[PDB]
Amino acid sequence: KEIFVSVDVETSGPIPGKYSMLSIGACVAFEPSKQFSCYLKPISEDFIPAAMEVTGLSLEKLHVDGLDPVDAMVQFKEWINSVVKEDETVVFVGFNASFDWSFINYYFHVYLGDNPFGIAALDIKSMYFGVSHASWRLTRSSEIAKVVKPEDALHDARYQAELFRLIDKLSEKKKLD
Amino acid sequence: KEIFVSVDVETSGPIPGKYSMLSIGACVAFEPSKQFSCYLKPISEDFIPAAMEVTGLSLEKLHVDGLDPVDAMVQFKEWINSVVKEDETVVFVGFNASFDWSFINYYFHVYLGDNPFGIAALDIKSMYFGVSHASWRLTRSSEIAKVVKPEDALHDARYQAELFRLIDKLSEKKKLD
Numbered sequence: 001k002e003i004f005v006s007v008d009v010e011t012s013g014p015i016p017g018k019y020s021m022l023s024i025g026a027c028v029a030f031e032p033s034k035q036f037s038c039y040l041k042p043i044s045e046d047f048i049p050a051a052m053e054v055t056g057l058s059l060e061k062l063h064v065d066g067l068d069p070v071d072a073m074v075q076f077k078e079w080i081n082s083v084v085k086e087d088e089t090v091v092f093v094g095f096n097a098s099f100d101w102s103f104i105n106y107y108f109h110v111y112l113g114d115n116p117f118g119i120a121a122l123d124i125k126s127m128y129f130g131v132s133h134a135s136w137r138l139t140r141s142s143e144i145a146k147v148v149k150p151e152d153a154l155h156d157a158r159y160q161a162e163l164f165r166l167i168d169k170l171s172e173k174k175k176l177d
Numbered sequence: 178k179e180i181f182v183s184v185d186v187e188t189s190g191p192i193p194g195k196y197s198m199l200s201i202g203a204c205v206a207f208e209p210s211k212q213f214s215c216y217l218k219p220i221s222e223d224f225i226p227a228a229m230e231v232t233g234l235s236l237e238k239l240h241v242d243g244l245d246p247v248d249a250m251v252q253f254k255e256w257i258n259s260v261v262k263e264d265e266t267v268v269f270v271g272f273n274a275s276f277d278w279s280f281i282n283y284y285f286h287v288y289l290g291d292n293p294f295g296i297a298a299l300d301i302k303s304m305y306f307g308v309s310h311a312s313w314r315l316t317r318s319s320e321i322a323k324v325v326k327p328e329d330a331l332h333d334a335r336y337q338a339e340l341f342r343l344i345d346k347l348s349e350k351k352k353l354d
Contacts, residue, residue: 126303
């Protein structure tokens, strides 16, 4: 009875504390119509320029427009509990999950003292590495999209959820055929 | 041309910065005789008692006996470069990889400004989730060990490397049969 949740974050740099989680996007992997997204105020002035070029965001604007980090993580928790029943379990799902998890875990423990996702994350590249036993270099998103033919942090969350479903079907078929 | 590296860390709590990475163990997944291990001085006074009960370590002793964190990450880097050729690529491998990666990434960027593993980690639970398409709850180490029948941060690194090899063989066989 598991509810898989596709999560993606935008950040101003490679690690939390020194750098900031700037936005969260999340959808229910198998019910992507159920969606969560918000922007955060930075917790640091430091940033990597290449990282800010990727996001397109402004730290100065987010200091005015973003949510206080505690409010963001409270709302994320509320959402998670809204899509997961007491008799159900949540599973964090990400693409290069360890990056996004490092920020989600840091912020949950800093601001709320607990991470409702628990302690483990499901990583789609790692899943595909096992389904297809291709090289690690060939788990890049573009190389996956050639094999599985799929059709902003929320946009990334929805796209990654679709990869998850297709790799899921590929492993189910491989297992049951 | 990829060199997989099984890594495990011991920590005083759930997230870096607020809590400390206390020890590193690492072996070459497919050449486990090549091994790296060290203890670190804490970077924080905070700790979760349950976490310290698991490790058996003493923060007060590690402040005297451990390596300065910069020296630990320099030595880890040297080791990584010692087992990986210029024409080769390293792949971080962990069990619940996102936990260990969050500490390894934090410390590499804090102390050295770069992570030689890159930006992604291979997670064994996620790999097995795809090879076997079992439930996530059934990716726990004990449940994996029932199916694949395998035979301290270094001890964990070597054990997890053996799970990796067996799941690897299971996906190769599943793919080629």
